[PDB]
Amino acid sequence: LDEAQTIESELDKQLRAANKVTNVLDTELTLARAAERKAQQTAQQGMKEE
């Protein structure tokens, strides 16, 4: 039980550390989606192929 609890704490630490990657990627994806929506709305103002 003690060994299992120690391993549980170690895995919880590892998961806590990994949460940073998910947060950074989520923030980057949100910013990228906002910028892409801005670019799309600016691009769709009407234009001929020529």
Place this chain on the structure above:
Amino acid sequence: LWREKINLLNARLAEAQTSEEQLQSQLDLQKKVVSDCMQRYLQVDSDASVAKAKLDEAQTIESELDKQLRAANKVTNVLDTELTLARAAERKAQQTAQQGMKEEERELCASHFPVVTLEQLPDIRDLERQHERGIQHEIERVKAELHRLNIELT
């Protein structure tokens, strides 16, 4: 201006770190109640049943505290990135500003150089380029005028 930014970001990051540390301490205390139940079990709705119920309760409660700690870590990482960027900008500006000035130099620079503020600090490079152009254009205009005066003199 970047040192002022770093001053603000230090306090904000300290507050975020305090929040994260308090949440982590509460989570670890919740985990520690598991060991306290063992200590009571060794020391003595029996005691064992109460220890079992409390361990299950702690494990159930653990999820929300863990999610709150994840949010606190999100905030702390955002503020740490902000502080890192501010520190990088301040380091970039530091070596250039340390050159030192005479009064006749700084007061000369006070001739319609802009007084950039913290809100305008991100755009300071644009202002520096704009005034570079402003001085360069006038210098070359005066150079052309000097050439014209040379022609007049001859």
